[PDB]
Design a protein around this ligand. Structure first.
Ligand code: FAD
Ligand code: FAD
Ligand code: FAD
Ligand code: 1TB
Ligand code: 1TB
Ligand code: 1TB
Ligand code: MG
Ligand code: MG
Ligand code: MG
Lengths: 582, 582, 582
């Protein structure tokens, strides 16, 4: 099948073996930034005709690009860096991918083996450093192990609970000649013998039974359902159970559906939290009962039976004790439960209409709401216009903060892998680079990065990348001259005492600083600004119509606040529904 | 002495205690970027009237700024970040400070103690991660320990071999009220009982004896002499021994002195290496026999007695076996040896004139040299003009690569802490932020950042910082559209096969991309470009005269090569003296 | 309440503070072996009038004695050793206590703080070494922390899932004078915030419901019920559900009860395993689904709903996925379920008589059985006679191997903490020392150690301890000249090819070697031997009647085999029911 590039008996550099290992893995895109310790790999990289490299302007831009790629496709993301500083500049991405469970494979060059542990030029114990922030990592000590390690890395990165895997390759190993054996068996006896088995009809039977015995059932869908979109959908029409989602599960189930309670959590809708607060059957599929969702654990879903299906055993019972658990692939769990539901149809007569109304009233008395002031642009409205003009078919990349929450609240995702946002670690400067990856992974798609002026600038250097790689990335910048989310907290908990949260120039407090348009100009990317709500729709429309890259600097009043809001460690009775820094 | 801000019996937040601990340490400048987990500290920070905060646009800019501060002053550098992503974004700086032995103290907020180890929002085992890349680190588990930990951190960071120390402070510890005890004794029994003692007249006597018995003595000065400038100077006029320096020791001894052999190493002058290759007495003061200096160890200084004085015992004998070692402060070693030299003056009759000539001939037959082509600007010449126009009294910040080597070769440092450059780890994107720190630490000084287009862009966001903080930073950008140092290696070892080393836009190969001037414009920083050598002096002169920030985009032909050059792991007989990518 | 021994304002050595901390913890017995690094503690120990020390002849005898103490009482066990070799000689005990979840506190002296990490005399990184084999450990760095660390150690050792905690105390800290503060609050925010909450009536309600809905229910009781003897008993008479127990749960429920299916597992009764193989409701209380119990996981209890109640969340779902879990104290779970069972009595009408008969038939067709040959002594019979003569009220200590399995099969424990045997790690040489601890903890009890000639000799030096401490320990030695359990495996899987399993003297293959009676003689402990089954009852009777220590060397044919037997990783269909090495 795989047509190689070297004679079956022809020796090649380890570098060449590693690249072929990537080709053999199906990799066709990598984000690598050249450095002395990784030159060989880059050279070997040019000899490949199937793998293309998107050279970023910073290694952090490399990983985030790799995450965007992974998140927007389902394929693993591949980033490559050199030794020392190259490697250290990946840390945030690795930690981010681990926290959000994103399939990733990072390759870093390392000093020659004999030089390791001598404070050699450009060296750092990257395996030591990254051990706690990666799913697993390796330090190649012989060119013979390359094929096996690369296969184990991709296997581990994409199986079970997806996650990052780093492979450290010494320079001398890169230059060493050898005849690769593409048959070696992986050495993963423990991991593999612990891989969940398909769900038993036994357990699934108990769930379908718990459902029929409930009056107030609620689905609590998370990131773990991103691949069971159909299965999940079907399950919903067979049970008619309201669907509340996490920030990571957005898209698994359409937001524009009447059964959709939308997002729950600290900034979830009042009705989604209500539904969970008063439920009697919590179907937690693909979630990890995070604190930004439970608040006070003892008070979370305290009135119902909890069914928790997760691919990671270490997650079942970590914070909430289920009354029914199922360790395994939620996609298969749904597939099985749908069967049972289709057969015992009539004998079940599932009807939760009364529950849905008790809910649809809350959805009515407390819908997501924003306020418009004069001709100022409401960020929510901006996002809403973007939704409308793109017909909600756009891939949305995001920074971290208020804009991130509004980009989640006011856009309606039809499918999963349309929403790329750093949730667990919440890393700033994620949007622009992530957009880059999503675009390369989806050439014919609309890719809009909804950023904040704070986040946007951290990895603004990637604008050079977007231009040179000629990627149609659109940047919907919601500029509010501040570090919004931190600012909102100062207002509500520190009597609005600003502590280094203003990003503009104090010398000219009324001038928009910096002038993001000029950053775009420097990288030859057409840009425009809008201040009046009136001419916002056309602005967004222009951005979309103009071929290629485009930056739309949208100005918003900073006193805006994300709502509703359940303070950290709170209860549904603590939800804040109104007020702003105004 | 220290007038507090809280009643001796008045409880305050841990946050307030930590800041007072910083004031009590003499800290008057910190570089902190606000985040949820560190809000309290930032609030406590606003209540301080002695400590000023320089808010960067990226946490990596925060640390590098802290390094620049430290390096340009001698004081420790203080950077503060939030939990999770804030913390991870410091890794490169910490690793950099450890490798170059820079006094640093980093404070990171952390999630509440009870939340630690639960995959909480924005958390990462920063102490675990940073253990191998820091001199030492802590995880505060009680507000009572703050005073002690902060004192131990500064003590450890600045004593012995300077280095980075990270202190992890949980959010709940920050908000906890207490009465600080500023008397607690440090718990450093092992460390302190191992702190080198002043040099014995015994050993020093043997060195002064070895000197008188030598014919070809050579001083190999390194970063460890940055505080013994005078002592070193005196020692030289009492012995008349030629001074070769490392990239980290530049400035310890004036480059514009006839006894100065300048820098040795991979890119050292042909005469400095010659002097060491043929010496019979190597006086290695404050060096760590790095590979970019020794190349092939068995061949390095293989013809002479090696005297190695280092403050770190783990360094003496790590690569080269001394024939005489002295574990202790080189400043004191010099002080003592100078005494012995002044007394036994006449009876010694130290004269190495013949050696100096055998050398001064090499210095003549092989001086540092560059070539001029038409009206193109030679980067070396540019730097030389900068030297002239600033009278070599400027503080020079640097990126990593060719420009870094030329900025080292063609500038004459009169004193130490005038040359701030990442040597051990060699981190890119170090120059702009480092310049920021050096400037804040030296308000009335000329601070020029000699950058490369590759490095400059990684942390270009710090231009916003420079403007808002109104710092007179000058950026002498040597734009060559490539990743120079990597490019030079492709030329000499890969038949000039470019592998992702071009930073411009392939669509318009002749247009300078990006347009660095517009980046400057976005942040309101006056900028200009020069392409003709003719009008270079005026350009540089303008940059200097124009009050405040200034960016001078200097265009250079990329086929330039740094010379001479001893390939990695080579010998003096392998030194390359000519050729370029032309 | 606690009357101290030092003035509230009187400084004392750390050593004195540590002992008072032990007195304040209720400790009245410790097993310590003096060494240079721990002298101070031993001195401080003599000044205590409440704590008595049982000096062993080996530190391994110290820990095992501490385990026996703990296991036979419920109180934590306290052993103390010196630095270096003293400490290392505890490793096996610590690992043993961790594996079996035994409350233990070990204190080791350490070299002075300043000497740590210098290869000092008698030092070893005991905290580093023991980190993975202890529940938690400490390294005291200041005399001020002694009170707090000791309190945290006992708290952690006895709470949640009991386990070993080691405290490393530097010599200088021991001699340092201070005024102890017995009020300091423990620093266990994470641990404490994660301590299970009492069971909710919700879950308990579901269990009681699952019971009424089952036809073939089976209780799978383990070590975790050792403190819920009554609760468990009551639960059984309210549901009439058969009770199968693990090797660690023996005694929780009386073996001499008709509802008792006895022990299950690799060497469990054929009927206990049958009951589990064909059950429809597995009530796993206080067990950890060990492999010596499940064999092939997919085949274990594969026909029923699994309810698993455990105090350790990390155990629920580790090997078998429950259909109902309850993280919390099984004692409280039982208490709650018994209430529900008493009220809904009539409406439940729980009757499992048919199940019990389907079982009582197996119990009849396949009872535990042994064979008698001529006048040779059957080890099983010996143990049975011991049971009879002691009326099953004796505390039984054990070695590891065949004798251990027979001591478990042929003795009927009425209550928990009557059976002290190393199960998880299965350490040899555990019996004699454990007996010592059980005896000191139960002065007026019959304490018989059923040992094997292999195990008995490893810590035979403790016979000196038994005599000097004048403890009424009886040693029922089942001498078979071999390493039985290993021997049985050679017979069934290696064609009886003996590989170093014979403990006698090959020169006189028929002579019993060694002569255990003479070991007893050396320590002045009356002893006797029996070879004829006929005069066995009187022999055992004598041992019991003779005041004080006594060793009865019982000779048995070695070709005996433990039965039944399900080979490692097997199924109930693989159970071996007959055959011996004969
Ligand atoms: C400023 C800010 C505010 C936030 N506010 C909110 C908020 O209000 N609400 C909110 O929801 N979040 C919020 N978050 C995000 C939050 O931090 C968590 O990232 C999010 O709650 C995690 O949701 P999750 O557990 O569903 O997804 P993940 O964290 O992706 O976890 C998925 C889980 O599914 C399991 N799983 C994976 N694949 C499969 C499979 N095939 N079959 C079965 N199981 C599988 C995993 O192993 C894991 O346990 C916020 C973050 C930031 C930065
Ligand atoms: C592109 C690139 C090229 C390079 N090329 C060269 C080159 O050609 N030549 C070159 O020199 N370097 C070069 N380097 C830098 C190089 O990596 C090393 O950083 C440098 O050689 C280290 O020199 P050092 O040992 O003198 O200083 P340091 O690394 O700072 O080490 C100082 C030493 O002094 C000891 N010491 C500290 N304080 C005291 C005191 N008070 N008393 C006594 N002892 C003390 C320390 O503990 C330590 O062992 C290059 C780096 C890069 C990025
Ligand atoms: C030669 C040899 C042969 C063996 N053969 C067998 C055999 O055939 N059958 C057999 O059973 N064993 C056998 N073993 C013993 C075996 O290795 C395991 O030690 C035993 O199966 C463990 O049983 P357990 O899980 O019930 O107890 P433990 O290992 O003590 O585990 C108890 C569990 O209960 C939990 N728990 C503790 N306290 C509480 C509380 N208050 N409330 C709720 N939960 C709590 C714990 O945290 C833990 O998960 C053998 C060992 C040896 C040396
Ligand atoms: C990146 O550094 C190393 O990996 C390295 C580290 C210590 C000893 C020998 C080497 S090496 O000989 O094997 N390679 C090397 O020095 N390289 C690959 C390198 N590349 C570039 C682009 N510049 C410089 O040095 C100034 N070195
Ligand atoms: C940064 O996060 C934490 O440190 C934290 C992590 C897990 C549980 C509880 C907390 S916390 O309650 O103590 N604090 C918190 O959630 N903060 C301080 C916070 N700050 C900001 C600016 N935004 C958000 O959340 C969206 N949280
Ligand atoms: C056990 O050793 C140590 O703990 C120790 C180790 C290194 C340096 C200094 C000491 S020490 O000075 O503080 N103590 C010491 O040497 N002791 C307490 C000791 N005790 C005995 C019974 N014999 C010997 O030494 C032969 N030393
Ligand atoms: Mg903003
Ligand atoms: Mg360049
Ligand atoms: Mg035996």
């Amino acid at each position: 099948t795989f047509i190689s590039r070297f004679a079956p008996d022809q020796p090649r550099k380890g570098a060449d073996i590693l690249v072929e290992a990537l080709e053999r893995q199906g990799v066709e895109t990598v984000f690598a930034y050249p450095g002395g310790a990784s030159m060989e790999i880059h050279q070997a990289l040019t000899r490949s005709s199937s793998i293309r490299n998107v050279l970023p302007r910073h290694e952090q831009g490399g990983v985030f690009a790799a995450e965007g790629y992974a998140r927007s496709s389902g394929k693993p993301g591949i980033c490559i860096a050199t030794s020392g500083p190259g490697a250290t500049n990946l840390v945030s991405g690795l930690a981010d991918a681990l926290l959000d469970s994103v399939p990733l494979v990072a390759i870093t060059g390392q000093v020659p083996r004999r030089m390791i542990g001598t404070d050699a030029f450009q060296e750092t114990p990257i395996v030591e450093v990254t051990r706690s922030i990666t799913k697993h990592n390796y330090l190649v000590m012989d060119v013979e192990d390359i094929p096996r390690i690369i296969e184990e890395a991709f296997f581990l990165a994409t199986s079970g609970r997806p996650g990052p895997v780093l492979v450290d390759v010494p320079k001398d190993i890169q230059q060493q000649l050898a005849i690769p054996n593409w048959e070696q068996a992986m050495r993963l006896p423990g991991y593999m013998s612990r891989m969940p088995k398909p769900p038993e009809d036994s357990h699934l039977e108990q769930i379908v039974r718990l459902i029929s015995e409930s009056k107030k059932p609620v689905l609590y869908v998370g990131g773990g359902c991103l691949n069971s979109s159909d299965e999940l959908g079907r399950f919903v029409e067979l049970t008619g159970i309201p669907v509340a989602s996490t920030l990571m599960g957005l898209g698994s189930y359409p937001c524009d559906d009447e059964l959709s309670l939308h997002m729950l959590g600290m900034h979830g809708t009042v009705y989604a939290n209500y539904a969970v607060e008063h439920s009697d059957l919590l179907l937690a599929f693909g979630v990890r009962f995070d604190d930004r969702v439970t608040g006070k654990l003892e008070a979370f879903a305290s009135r119902a039976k909890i069914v928790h299906i997760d691919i990671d055993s270490a997650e079942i019972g970590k914070n909430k004790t289920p009354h029914v658990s199922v360790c395994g692939d939620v996609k298969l769990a749904l597939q099985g439960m749908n069967k049972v539901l289709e057969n015992r149809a009539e004998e079940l007569k599932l009807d939760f209409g009364v529950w849905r109304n008790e809910l649809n009233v809350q959805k009515q008395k407390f819908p997501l709401s924003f306020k418009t002031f004069g001709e100022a642009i409401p960020p929510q409205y901006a996002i809403k216009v973007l939704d409308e003009l793109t017909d909600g078919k756009a891939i949305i990349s995001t920074g971290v903060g208020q804009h991130q929450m509004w980009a989640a609240q006011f856009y309606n995702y039809k499918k999963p892998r349309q929403w790329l946002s750093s949730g667990g670690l919440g890393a700033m400067g994620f949007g622009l680079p992530a957009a880059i990856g999503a675009s390369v992974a989806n050439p014919d798609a609309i890719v809009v990065d909804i950023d904040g002026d704070g986040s946007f600038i951290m990895n603004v250097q990637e604008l050079a990348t977007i231009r040179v790689e000629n990627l149609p990335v659109k940047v919907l910048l919601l500029n509010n001259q501040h570090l919004g989310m931190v600012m909102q907290w100062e207002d509500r908990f520190y009597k609005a005492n600003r502590a280094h949260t203003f990003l503009g120039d104090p010398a000219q407090e009324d001038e928009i600083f910096p002038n993001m348009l000029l950053f775009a100009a420097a990288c030859g990317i057409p840009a425009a600004r809008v201040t009046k709500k009136a001419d916002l729709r056309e602005a967004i429309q222009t951005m979309l119509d103009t071929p290629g890259p485009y930056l739309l600097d949208v100005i918003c009043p900073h006193q805006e606040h994300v709502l509703p809001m359940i303070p950290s460690g709170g209860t549904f009775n603590d939800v804040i529904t109104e007020g702003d820094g105004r």
